[PDB]
């Protein structure tokens, strides 16, 4: 029996820029129990059908992180935006499922939770399944930075602002991507 309970029920989720990966190998799992569960706001399967998930194969990958509700769209085969370009990219030939659920009750705090980070600046886009965790100051213009933070010399990581009374689009959503 697969340790999916460790992935979906972990108290702490990773920041999207430092997205967590957990490989699931010699075990059995009931993929249709998760699909019809009234716990997930999103369960989109690309390349495979969510009905025939049990009647299929290999090892599985479970990537997890937290993003804004209006960024759940970027976790798809051919998307653009700060998260899809600089944080987590799924290939066009992606075979797997993107799972998400509102975690406002868990990851928002009175006055704001700023512990969840995303990459805002980068000289280049990420390749599918690439994890970038470097912290190099970004030279936004012609003035050199010299490793010193200042105007147009920005740290690449920024904090999300998770407040409980935010609208659904600005609320935290826990994401689990299963790759096959």
């Amino acid at each position, epitope marked *: 029996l697969c340790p999916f309970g460790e992935v979906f029920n972990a108290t702490r989720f990773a920041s999207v820029y430092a997205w967590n990966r957990k490989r699931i190998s010699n075990c059995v799992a009931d993929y249709s129990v998760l699909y019809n569960s009234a716990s997930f706001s999103t369960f989109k399967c690309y390349g495979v059908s969510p009905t025939k998930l049990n009647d299929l194969c290999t090892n599985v990958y479970a990537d997890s992180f937290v993003i804004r509700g209006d960024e759940v769209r970027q976790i798809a085969p051919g998307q653009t935006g700060k998260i899809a370009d600089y944080n987590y990219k799924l290939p066009d030939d992606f075979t797997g499922c993107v799972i998400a659920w509102n975690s406002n009750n868990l990851d928002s705090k009175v006055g704001g939770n700023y512990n969840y980070l995303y990459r*805002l*600046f980068r000289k280049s886009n990420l390749k599918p399944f690439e994890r970038d965790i470097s912290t190099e100051i970004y*030279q*936004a*213009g*012609s*003035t*050199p930075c010299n490793g010193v933070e*200042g*105007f*147009n010399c*920005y740290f690449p990581l920024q904090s999300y602002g998770f407040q409980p009374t935010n609208g659904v689009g600005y609320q935290p959503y826990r994401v689990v991507v299963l790759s096959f």
Partner: antibody
Amino acid sequence: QVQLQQSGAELARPGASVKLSCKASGYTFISNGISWVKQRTGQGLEWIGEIYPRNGNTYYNEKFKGKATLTADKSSSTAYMELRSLTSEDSAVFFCARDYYYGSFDYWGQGTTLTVSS
Amino acid sequence: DIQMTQSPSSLSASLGERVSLTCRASREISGYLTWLQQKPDGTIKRLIYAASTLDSGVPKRFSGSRSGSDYSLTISSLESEDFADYYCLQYASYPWTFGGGTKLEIKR
């Protein structure tokens, strides 16, 4: 083609505020910083400040703090400079210019002449 | 703050003459220096960036150099179009700062 198109010649009264525009086309607005320069008739060039449109971060020359306010509009790819409590000393040509990745200012707006008079 | 001291403020010269304009930076600017030309109509054009790199569409008579904190703009042989205002600009540190300018006029 990269172009910075500034607002037309402007007349404003003393004590009044003005809002100058600098429309950018021919590249992605958030990629580069937009700066402003003041030049009074027969006088030198003065760096006013710069705005980085991607995050709205700004930096000003101390002499222009309060006097000028730079804002950006990602929707219309237009840069703005609001000039407050206008006096005859603010009558000058105002330019916008692009702070490129390297080489400082590559492109410049045509200029906007401001006249502060009653 | 970085002060760019430009000299001379005014210069009288003849066609075919060799002229040099200097900008002294009050502190280290590591060659992040631009030279601009303003024609009598107000049009600004970049001559040099990075202290010595000639911009495309700028004639070869123009060249930029650096001794220590002295940055020079040299015109090997003056032409009619060259009688104009010149300004240097440092971009090594915020706030960026201009030199006071040089008015190049015709000697007679």
